[PDB]
Write a protein that binds this ligand. Sequence first.
Ligand SMILES: [Mg+2]
Ligand SMILES: [Mg+2]
Ligand SMILES: [Mg+2]
Ligand SMILES: [Mg+2]
Ligand SMILES: [Mg+2]
Ligand SMILES: [Mg+2]
Ligand SMILES: [Mg+2]
Ligand SMILES: [Mg+2]
Ligand SMILES: [Mg+2]
Ligand SMILES: [Mg+2]
Ligand SMILES: [Mg+2]
Ligand SMILES: [Mg+2]
Ligand SMILES: [Mg+2]
Ligand SMILES: [Mg+2]
Ligand SMILES: [Mg+2]
Ligand SMILES: [Mg+2]
Ligand SMILES: [Mg+2]
Ligand SMILES: [Mg+2]
Ligand SMILES: [Mg+2]
Ligand SMILES: [Mg+2]
Ligand SMILES: [Mg+2]
Ligand SMILES: [Mg+2]
Ligand SMILES: [Mg+2]
Ligand SMILES: [Mg+2]
Ligand SMILES: [Mg+2]
Ligand SMILES: [Mg+2]
Ligand SMILES: [Mg+2]
Ligand SMILES: [Mg+2]
Ligand SMILES: [Mg+2]
Ligand SMILES: [Mg+2]
Ligand SMILES: [Mg+2]
Ligand SMILES: [Mg+2]
Ligand SMILES: [Mg+2]
Lengths: 120, 209, 114, 5, 122, 56
Amino acid sequence: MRHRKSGRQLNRNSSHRQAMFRNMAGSLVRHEIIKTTLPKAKELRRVVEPLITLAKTDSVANRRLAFARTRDNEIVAKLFNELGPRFASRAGGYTRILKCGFRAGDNAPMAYIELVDRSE
Amino acid sequence: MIGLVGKKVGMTRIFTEDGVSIPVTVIEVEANRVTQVKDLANDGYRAIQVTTGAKKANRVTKPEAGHFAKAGVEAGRGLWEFRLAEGEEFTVGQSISVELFADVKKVDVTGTSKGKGFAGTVKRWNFRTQDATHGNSLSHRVPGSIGQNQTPGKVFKGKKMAGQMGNERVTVQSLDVVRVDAERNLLLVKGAVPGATGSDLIVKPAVKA
Amino acid sequence: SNIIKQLEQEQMKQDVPSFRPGDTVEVKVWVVEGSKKRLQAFEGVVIAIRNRGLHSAFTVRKISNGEGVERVFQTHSPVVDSISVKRRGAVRKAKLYYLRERTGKAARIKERLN
Amino acid sequence: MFKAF
Amino acid sequence: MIQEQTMLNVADNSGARRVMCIKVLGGSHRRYAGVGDIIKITIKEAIPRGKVKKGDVLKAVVVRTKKGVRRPDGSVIRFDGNACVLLNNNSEQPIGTRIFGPVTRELRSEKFMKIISLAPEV
Amino acid sequence: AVQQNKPTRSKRGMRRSHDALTAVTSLSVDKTSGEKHLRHHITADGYYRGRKVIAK
RNA sequence: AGGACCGAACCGACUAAUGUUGAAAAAUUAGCGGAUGACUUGUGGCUGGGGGUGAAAGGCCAAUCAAACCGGGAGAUAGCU
RNA sequence: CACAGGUGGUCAGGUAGAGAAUACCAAGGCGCUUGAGAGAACUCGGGUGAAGGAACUAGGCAAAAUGGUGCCGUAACUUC
RNA sequence: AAUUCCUUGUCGGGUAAGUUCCGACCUGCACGAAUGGCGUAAUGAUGGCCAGGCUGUCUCCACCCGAGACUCAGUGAAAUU
RNA sequence: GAUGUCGGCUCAUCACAUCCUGGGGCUGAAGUAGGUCCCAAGGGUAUGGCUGUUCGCCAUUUAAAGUGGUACGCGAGCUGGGUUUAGAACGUCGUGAGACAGUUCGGUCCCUAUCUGCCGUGGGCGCUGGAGAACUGAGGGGGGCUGCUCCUAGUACGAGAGGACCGGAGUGGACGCAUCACUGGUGUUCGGGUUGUCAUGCCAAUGGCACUGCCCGGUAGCUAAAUGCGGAAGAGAUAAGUGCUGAAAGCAUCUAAGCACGAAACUUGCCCCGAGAUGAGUUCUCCCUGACCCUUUAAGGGUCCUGAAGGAACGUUGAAGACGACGACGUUGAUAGGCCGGGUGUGUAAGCGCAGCGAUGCGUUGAGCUAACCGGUACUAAUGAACCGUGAGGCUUAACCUU
Ligand SMILES: [Mg+2]
Ligand SMILES: [Mg+2]
Ligand SMILES: [Mg+2]
Ligand SMILES: [Mg+2]
Ligand SMILES: [Mg+2]
Ligand SMILES: [Mg+2]
Ligand SMILES: [Mg+2]
Ligand SMILES: [Mg+2]
Ligand SMILES: [Mg+2]
Ligand SMILES: [Mg+2]
Ligand SMILES: [Mg+2]
Ligand SMILES: [Mg+2]
Ligand SMILES: [Mg+2]
Ligand SMILES: [Mg+2]
Ligand SMILES: [Mg+2]
Ligand SMILES: [Mg+2]
Ligand SMILES: [Mg+2]
Ligand SMILES: [Mg+2]
Ligand SMILES: [Mg+2]
Ligand SMILES: [Mg+2]
Ligand SMILES: [Mg+2]
Ligand SMILES: [Mg+2]
Ligand SMILES: [Mg+2]
Ligand SMILES: [Mg+2]
Ligand SMILES: [Mg+2]
Ligand SMILES: [Mg+2]
Ligand SMILES: [Mg+2]
Ligand SMILES: [Mg+2]
Ligand SMILES: [Mg+2]
Ligand SMILES: [Mg+2]
Ligand SMILES: [Mg+2]
Ligand SMILES: [Mg+2]
Ligand SMILES: [Mg+2]
């Protein structure tokens, strides 16, 4: 059964699944918009968005905590220096998912995921 | 005897002065409003149709709205019927609350049980599993034999096999009414009842008596 | 769950003292022998506590007449009359199940001299 | 292939 | 939960140290004996010069179990080991003249009042 | 394990009666770009709900 | 010193599961035996079918062995299907 | 067969280690030529388990368990 | 008894209960002395039996992590008839 | 030109020549307990030691541990211990190769389900206008076991010993259903400890890998060992059986006419499915009130206008689920995520200071972190539409409403 459970297995083990989202989370921070499969984008919200909330308050402990979850100082600097201040007023919902058809290689349903403040 | 429709709030413990702990399922029974009364001369049997709760008017269909408007009642979660005995009579639009069970000692609670989905014979029918070792080959929890060779040459009706389990109407009988709280529309019954939290629930006086 | 929450809150004991795992706690529990009620004391080390509001409970371990005994008390049950902290112990864990494998000197617990 | 003697 | 082949310590001074349960009495297909239940036992180890000897087949009443005992309020009482008191096969009365270790309240029956009177604790 | 008789043309046809595909009921029309697209999906030129969400 | 001991490489193949239209016409995985010797291995050579070789199982002699393989007698014979 | 097989030599880094075992790495080389979802039964490869502990079974099959260094200590039987 | 048909021979030990096992008896159907008799320390992936530890082997299964099964896209078999 | 064999395991189904429970007649039936026969198949109807065994003996239970059929039920379900391939040996027979319902040690169990069958779950069409709901219940299935203690009562009975029927109450075993409040398991998505090594420049702090590296705890969910409930009363017609009145047959006679009682069997009562019940049922609401054209002039075809109730599709999703299906919701919005608060779990984070040569300790501090949970919040995603479905619904007869 699967009653009241959360988190997609995505046909991966725990180690691979954790590593993949760490890489994907850094990509979304580095590139404000990325293209991924629809189910993967839905799971990425539960990983990237907490990091942005963590970046709301700038402190040594928070930066180290963010580093432990991203293992990329460039991402940590991006989160606390730019993303944190930009989303300081938003109460969640820092990312938006847009469906963009299906993948030619395997017909997988794709979707764009981007930060809501990409406007320039 | 007429019953009421409620919702499964959850399970809770009730302590008593003597030191006994009574596990009680909390059932909320809002005002049950009678929507239609079935008459022998018109429907062939005596019964009442009632509705409980409320639902957003945006999702109320026109044919459903007219039925409620006929009795001058607000749309509810759904419609349920209760058969009437010889001495029972009700009027359309009447509101029935949990005080009906104030003098009732035993009740029968019916509801849709939890849905287990496709279940094997071991879980569904308590089939004994075969040896996990000692040479067993891909038959650790398979059903096993299902017939008796040529003579019957077939599988009989009702053979116990894997299939959908749960998610069906189930009735539990002779549950003690621990407490009736009319001020809060709450009914406490000793023991568990079918269904998950928030599922529709039907409570009737114990027919077994 | 507001309905459930207030139902339990209305019957939760208010005089529950503060204690931690590893503390030596004496529990007064009502016992009935015929028509007369009585109080008997159960003193031991608190090895486990679960906080669940009205469903909170704690486990007390003692060695009685050479036999280890563990009692799981329902914190808010009327059966237990009172709880008293005789001594405070210093432990690094919430659960002290490892004490089940120890006796005598090995089972000693340091005092929490805050 | 089973036998029968 | 005491089954067949389960080894239990002896809570009385009858001379037996530990016994094996060979039958859970009181029903058909019954497989568990709790506190206060009678079980057929065989003595596996005993002291010399005791009133019982190794290999004897008797019946005993379970007084302590690891699984524990459930109280009306939901509390549980557990012991570090399983213990029993030997009883006469024909009269099912206690054989030993003393009881060792604590005893549990569900022995409060007219047929076990002797054990409670000798019980050091409750 | 294996068939004892050869299934007919008829049997094959009725088994495939449920294999037919279903066409999309309709295509949404963007309020600004006017291009047809799957509902709740961005258009070919990156428009969605009247906004050019995608740069390309 | 050792057909000595424990144990990798190396050479074996005792148990179990999987596989059995297999990844594989004999394997994989986890254990297992020998591991300075009657050991193991590379290259080349010799023994040819009623013969070879065989610490001997009728084992092996090119996925074939109580008489190899290829061609020939040959369209053997078949009171049988 | 772009096949979980078979195939003789030479080179032999770092930390821990008795070690060419094993673990993580360097130089270097790879992710094994269908993917994307779902998280039913059942099958396969594994993890954990209340109380009991061979009651299983043809049989403790399989699993679990023991597991290293020094030091103390070690019986019958021995062809010593 | 790797030998005993009668046979689960009889007696003793082990177990609450032992057609197996160990010891003994001799009524050896049908042991026996280099196609060797009887012993034998050590050795054995050897046969039988018992005990401690150990455990999902089991009472009685429960949950969980992965690869299939299931759905979608691509490619696309087989025995049989 | 193949129907695999004993026994075990799993799963069974039927018969009644009935093992237990139920109802009776006799008894050399005082009571308790038995013997024998009749009715009764609804439910129930042991775990172990030895042996490959079925069987059997033995140990200890039980209300009882029934007898049989079903390819001596069941290997395209499992096992392979026993017989019965090739190896080897003993005894025995034969000069010998070999041989033995003689014995010993070892010894490959293949098949992706087309059909029937069965367990589940959908699509299509039908039910005569269409649509949304709630129902009647023809039919079918599930369930049906039983111990002990107490009271009646140490009463009836009996010289004593011993010890009830009939009726009540309580508490159990086995089995079934439901559920997580409790007690627990699991909890590789939550904390913490720790070994080796590598990396982030280094210290500090962290991360990767080693079965989740090895471990200690644990939220939700699932779950049993956990805790609630269930078997029935009652009614109808009866079996064996017991009767009332009563002739044939002046009597007698339960029977021929006519009445009464009578069991876990039967029909109901209880639970579940159920109008594909084509015999396709009933009740309550909702929706549609246009133009014409053609001849093969009839339940006829076609164009224009129209597109309702409702459905579907898509999207966010569920304690619903293999996929379909089913339930919730789509801005007039709490469906999911995030966010805020709280609760849980872990157990005093990091940084800094103070003590110590140091490991480390202490203060800040029950700190930090915290998954699925609880109560909230439109911050993100659930689009304005399109699509399907129509336009008053056949004939005959009858009864009313009428002209
Ligand atoms: Mg996949
Ligand atoms: Mg890992
Ligand atoms: Mg479900
Ligand atoms: Mg196999
Ligand atoms: Mg297996
Ligand atoms: Mg068969
Ligand atoms: Mg037939
Ligand atoms: Mg050697
Ligand atoms: Mg190997
Ligand atoms: Mg070696
Ligand atoms: Mg031979
Ligand atoms: Mg060959
Ligand atoms: Mg010729
Ligand atoms: Mg020819
Ligand atoms: Mg390849
Ligand atoms: Mg290596
Ligand atoms: Mg799985
Ligand atoms: Mg266990
Ligand atoms: Mg057995
Ligand atoms: Mg083994
Ligand atoms: Mg192991
Ligand atoms: Mg034994
Ligand atoms: Mg002997
Ligand atoms: Mg001889
Ligand atoms: Mg050897
Ligand atoms: Mg495909
Ligand atoms: Mg044939
Ligand atoms: Mg009946
Ligand atoms: Mg047979
Ligand atoms: Mg068989
Ligand atoms: Mg065999
Ligand atoms: Mg023969
Ligand atoms: Mg460091």
